[PDB]
Amino acid sequence: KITVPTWAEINLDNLRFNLNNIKNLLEEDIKICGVIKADAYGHGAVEVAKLLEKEKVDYLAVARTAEGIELRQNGITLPILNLGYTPDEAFEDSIKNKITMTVYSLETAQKINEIAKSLGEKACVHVKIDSGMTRIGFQPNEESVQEIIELNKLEYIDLEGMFTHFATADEVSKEYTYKQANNYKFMSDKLDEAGVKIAIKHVSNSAAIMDCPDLRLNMVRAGIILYGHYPSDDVFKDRLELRPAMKLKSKIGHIKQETIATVPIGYADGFTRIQKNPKVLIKGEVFDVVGRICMDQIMVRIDKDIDIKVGDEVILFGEGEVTAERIAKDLGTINYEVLCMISRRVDRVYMENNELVQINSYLL
Amino acid sequence: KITVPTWAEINLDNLRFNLNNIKNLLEEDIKICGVIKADAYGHGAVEVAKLLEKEKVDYLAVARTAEGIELRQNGITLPILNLGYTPDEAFEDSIKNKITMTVYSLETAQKINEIAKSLGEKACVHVKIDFQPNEESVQEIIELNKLEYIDLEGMFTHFATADEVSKEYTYKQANNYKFMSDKLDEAGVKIAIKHVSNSAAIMDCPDLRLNMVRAGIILYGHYPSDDVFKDRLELRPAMKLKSKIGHIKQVEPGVGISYGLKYTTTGKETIATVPIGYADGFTRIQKNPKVLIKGEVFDVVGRICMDQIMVRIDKDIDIKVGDEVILFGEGEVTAERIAKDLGTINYEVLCMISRRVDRVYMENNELVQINSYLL
Ligand SMILES: Cc1ncc(COP(=O)(O)O)c(CN[C@@H]2CONC2=O)c1O
Ligand SMILES: Cc1ncc(COP(=O)(O)O)c(CN[C@@H]2CONC2=O)c1O
Structure with a gap:
């Protein structure tokens, strides 16, 4: 699918x-x-x-x-x-x-x-x-x-x-x-x-x-x-319970012996090269992205004893410790921007009851 | 059109x-x-x-x-x-x-x-x-x-x-x-x-x-770095990221602009609002964002918003709503400049142009084609 x-x-x-x-x-x-x-x-x-x-x-x-x-x-x-x-x-x-x-x-x-x-x-x-924004009106x-x-x-x-x-x-x-x-x-x-x-x-x-x-x-x-996010850390979060809706995902495309995993996501998917401390989640563990983020791929150091194979799922944000907010903080921007960065070629796939119900390509 | x-x-x-x-x-x-x-x-x-x-x-x-x-x-x-x-x-x-x-x-x-x-x-x-x-x-x-x-x-x-x-x-x-x-x-x-x-x-x-x-x-008209032999190959950049002046007004001294009111005016100022923002790929991370209007460079002021920006016009130019704004691809506003401000590369600035930004193609200074990725 x-x-x-x-x-x-x-x-x-x-x-x-x-x-x-x-x-x-x-x-x-x-x-x-x-x-x-x-x-x-x-x-x-x-x-x-x-x-x-x-x-x-x-x-x-x-x-x-x-x-x-x-x-x-x-x-x-x-x-x-x-x-x-x-x-x-x-x-x-x-x-x-x-x-x-x-x-x-x-x-x-x-x-x-x-x-x-x-x-x-x-x-x-x-x-x-x-009224005070000084933008429009x-x-x-x-x-x-x-x-x-x-x-x-x-x-x-x-x-x-x-x-x-x-x-x-x-x-x-x-x-x-x-x-x-x-x-x-x-x-x-x-x-x-x-x-x-x-x-x-x-x-x-x-x-x-x-x-x-x-x-x-x-x-x-x-x-x-x-979309499951707060406009800041200063609002009364205890008022409203939220679940983030978006998970940005890729697959492990290659593995090599340090163990280096190559993932087919890059700055042209919106995973911006500006990040100074880019990270990923794989099998529940966080790993450093290493070397410059490239247009279409990134290299990640696997420094933990996990069984990992080509095809395994990589989470860039939306789960556990890897969040859009974390990336935003690393950037010195806001969650809003990280969400909007997801580029055209990244298919939106919609889930419902844990089933995939829909896949949208913005190219085809 | x-x-x-x-x-x-x-x-x-x-x-x-x-x-x-x-x-x-x-x-x-x-x-x-x-x-x-x-x-x-x-x-x-x-x-x-x-x-x-x-x-x-x-x-x-x-x-x-x-x-x-x-x-x-x-x-x-x-x-x-x-x-x-x-x-x-x-x-x-x-x-x-x-x-x-x-x-x-x-x-x-x-x-x-x-x-x-x-x-x-x-x-x-x-x-x-x-x-x-x-x-x-x-x-x-x-x-x-x-x-x-x-x-x-x-x-x-x-x-x-x-x-x-x-x-x-x-x-x-x-x-x-x-x-x-x-x-x-x-x-x-x-x-x-x-x-x-x-x-x-x-x-x-x-x-x-x-x-x-x-x-x-x-x-595309850009060099992979400043270190290559540029004199071997003459290049013309192909892309110009453009918007229109959506609003223009005279703002009093000491009034805050945009989210967090991070820019406050220092006298009476002419502020132009332009309908481009970080969701068009004009990233909010820029510390020194600028625009070109009628051949002059102006500071973008206050936080860049999702869909729009504020620009101080501090020169005696004749600007009316609808006038053309250049974000990069002409004169002193270049993708390279933005890249350097951001600490990235021209490649990334070019690729940041988002889906909702129509591509319009020019040829002999005439528009020949307009592509919407939404419609
Ligand atoms: C295999 C391959 N060949 C050729 C090119 C063309 O490169 P130039 O644009 O420099 O001619 C690229 C671009 N790769 C991009 C360039 O920067 N980062 C990347 O991953 C590439 O990945
Ligand atoms: C006029 C207007 N109304 C409502 C909203 C919704 O705001 P929340 O998403 O915080 O509920 C925005 C968001 N404007 C975006 C948010 O960040 N920058 C912007 O320009 C807006 O410009």
Whole structure:
């Protein structure tokens, strides 16, 4: 069944476990947006979306029009929100495929409106508020409020939602986070007061869902925690029990007498050469990767008395002491990036009840 | 029509230039193997293969059965050599798709042979030498050569240090190969294709041509190191990683930017947000990330996010949303620069370009083709 030497194993059971533990945090009326941008953080957006439609979630979020359309082309019917920039070249496609667009200027809204009029159907949009991230969004001021009342009047636009995003909600002190929330509440209250109707207000990411049970509003945005990982070591982990879903695996391709094992995974699979202390798990024991990581393979020193043969399974992360977090720490980056590094040629294989149920090649 | 906010622009003209300058190094009868593993080092294996069939090259090389089969599924007819490991689970598919397999041992050759027998057609194989270069290996090879449903077509080794200043070790490896080559010549064994040279060797070692050379990094317009003889071979990089300015704003003094608010403004600043992030392969690890906009270099500020970055515009330029941003492949922003910042190599920076980044191909300064790996 598996014909590639190196694959990403995704445990669908663990995803369900994570989602259900997330849902147990939430009250009945609070909506869940499943964040599945960057191919569901490396796990496979189409498949993870299929699971989310089954488990019933209220919205899907992506980072790009094309990620949105890929989901549509694969049968997905859930509302999809592009969280970021939509270039003008992609408005038509967004509207035709019912992808909800993030909007953060009146100019953008007006051009979208012309296209939606042109096509003779409404564009659904969510307004972004820059509450403290300084990334995307309207500033939280009197000027933005009027610009929003204005864009709300554009026939051929359904101003459905409004959101902001926290820059430091995974840190110990939530001061800045609540400072951001207040900037949002400013816009929320002024628009409430201006008779502008916004069905979906949302602000909470994974960190906020966990640590800030007062920031639920109409909906929350669950990303990293869906996949079985914490946004940091500083969040209240005891609130939510998680199982990581991804195991990055290869096979022992060669053995040689030190005993050196050659494994057919390299930096072009996302096992980055930058790692200063690369390690692997084999038959429950951790071993050093030795010499430079190559494009398509690495050499590992077996310095323990284990019976090991060509074909035996190697785990790069997702089990025992070899974790995406460990690699991230070695890199000086974050688990998010390690997950997203898994490259195109790495087949995603999905497990369920300990059976392989599906294998996706991104080449064939 | 480009509809993605972030793309990898591949200049086909430059690829042709590189290949032709490579061909000018080579004598009439020496074959070229175009190394296009890892999706042609991020440039697009299918398209680069199409170009190579057009420009005529002898052979294609890949790192994985599936890379080989992807090329076949897209009409490619050139010989393809899997340079790396073929698991037993993939022998059948290799043979059925005429993917030439690298072999290291008699035992592997014999199993392949059974499958080829089973399928009633020959497997094409190339022998790899570290097969120790001793008398034992030479008989083992004369043995495998006999096996009926295998075509022992070629034999090769690969240099570990040919891009360094001193090749001593390289010529040490070459000798070990020449031992095997001469003993098999002397036995009855044919070997139509003997090859050893990678990009570094093609450049610095004009005596290691044999029947064929393996051109990789150089094809794409990059040098395997700073130590090779660059003056022998003029290269034009083929790839430009680009995005668009997605948002632009004037930010007050002392305001934090991005996760952890690790950059705070030091006066009023113009901040451009660009829709490229670490999940497009613009790694967050970079300590000094930069971008080129309207010919000027700018600092990326605050943490690089999954899907976007913040850029301080501190020069009097006229920039509007939609304007073009270059992450590398032009002027001072190069894959090599990023590699050096990271403590890795240009090879890795090229290969980091992720699936969602559309490859768009240019030719005479016109867009001729756009490939989405999502749609
Ligand atoms: C607008 C927005 N909402 C929700 C999320 C989900 O966050 P969690 O995954 O922490 O729940 C992200 C993630 N943005 C990624 C996370 O890291 N860097 C980024 O840009 C985001 O940009
Ligand atoms: C067997 C073999 N031959 C030829 C090449 C071509 O190398 P150049 O790109 O230098 O021409 C490679 C690339 N191997 C890559 C280069 O860096 N690390 C690797 O594992 C290879 O593995």
